[PDB]
Amino acid sequence: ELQEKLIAVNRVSKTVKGGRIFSFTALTVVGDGNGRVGFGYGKAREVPAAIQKAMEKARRNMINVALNNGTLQHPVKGVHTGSRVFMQPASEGTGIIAGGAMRAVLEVAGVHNVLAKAYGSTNPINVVRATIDGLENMNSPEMVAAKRGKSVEEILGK
RNA sequence: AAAUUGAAGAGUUUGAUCAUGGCUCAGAUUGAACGCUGGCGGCAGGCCUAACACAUGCAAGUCGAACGGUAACAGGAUUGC
Ligand SMILES: [Mg+2]
Ligand SMILES: [Mg+2]
Ligand SMILES: [Mg+2]
Ligand SMILES: [Mg+2]
Ligand SMILES: [Mg+2]
Ligand SMILES: [Mg+2]
Ligand SMILES: [Mg+2]
Ligand SMILES: [Mg+2]
Numbered sequence: 001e002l003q004e005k006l007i008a009v010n011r012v013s014k015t016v017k018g019g020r021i022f023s024f025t026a027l028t029v030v031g032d033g034n035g036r037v038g039f040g041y042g043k044a045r046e047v048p049a050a051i052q053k054a055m056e057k058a059r060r061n062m063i064n065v066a067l068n069n070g071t072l073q074h075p076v077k078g079v080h081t082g083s084r085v086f087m088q089p090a091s092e093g094t095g096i097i098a099g100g101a102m103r104a105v106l107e108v109a110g111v112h113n114v115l116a117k118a119y120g121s122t123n124p125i126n127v128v129r130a131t132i133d134g135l136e137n138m139n140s141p142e143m144v145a146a147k148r149g150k151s152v153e154e155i156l157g158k
Numbered sequence: 159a160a161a162u163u164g165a166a167g168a169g170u171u172u173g174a175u176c177a178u179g180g181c182u183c184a185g186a187u188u189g190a191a192c193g194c195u196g197g198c199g200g201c202a203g204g205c206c207u208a209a210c211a212c213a214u215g216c217a218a219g220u221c222g223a224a225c226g227g228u229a230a231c232a233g234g235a236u237u238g239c
């Protein structure tokens with residue numbers, strides 16, 4: 001029903017008196033392609049087990065993002081701990097031009113044409129969180145017409 | 159009416175993580191050089207170094223409608239007619 005993508009897999013380790021204990025962590029993003037996207041971070045010891053955990057976490061905890069026929073309403077700046085994310089609406093036919101982590105988020109969310117850039121740290125989990133944060137706070141022209149006392153015509157047509 | 163439509167990251171410090179941070183690569187480009195190989199055509203480019211030294215040929219001559227003229231031949235009658 002909804003598209004799901006695996007972004008990154010990493011092998012983490014912890015130290016016990018017996019020795020080193022290893023595990024695999026998988027970051028995935030899911031979305032219906034119609035303005036809903038969620039990210040999940042699974043953590044297990046076997047790679048197939050971890051990716052399933054990530055999908056389960058990503059399947060819930062979704063967010064709703066307004067899309068203007070496959071592009072953003074206005075340019076936005078997503079910021080998380082270390083990663084600075086700048087996204088910008090683009091014309092028809094430009095495609096998804098973004099980093100490896102950012103491209104997966106925008107594809108499953110339904111964004112087709114967009115210009116994006118990542119500044120600072122490019123750690124995949126931080127980048128996707130910033131992209132999620134940068135899209136959830138984006139407001140549609142109806143929303144700004146709701147906060148202010150003017151109708152859609154006055155907001156843009158005027 | 160148009161004169162435009164525009165932005166990607168990855169590797170590497172750790173037992174593992176985040177950040178900082180340098181290093182390195184994926185691109186475009188050249189008056190190119192070298193290695194291997196090599197069919198045709200169009201188009202352009204071709205001493206970036208010693209403003210180092212130069213054999214030899216050529217690259218600035220025209221004007222008898224300025225003038226005295228006749229040295230070569232071209233003619234007419236030794237003769238510039
Ligand atoms: Mg690592
Ligand atoms: Mg950095
Ligand atoms: Mg780092
Ligand atoms: Mg990492
Ligand atoms: Mg680095
Ligand atoms: Mg080392
Ligand atoms: Mg050669
Ligand atoms: Mg041929």
Ligand SMILES: [Mg+2]
């Ligand atoms: Mg020279």
Ligand SMILES: [Mg+2]
């Ligand atoms: Mg000289």
Ligand SMILES: [Mg+2]
């Ligand atoms: Mg000549």
Ligand SMILES: [Mg+2]
Binds near residue numbers: 229
């Ligand atoms: Mg003579």
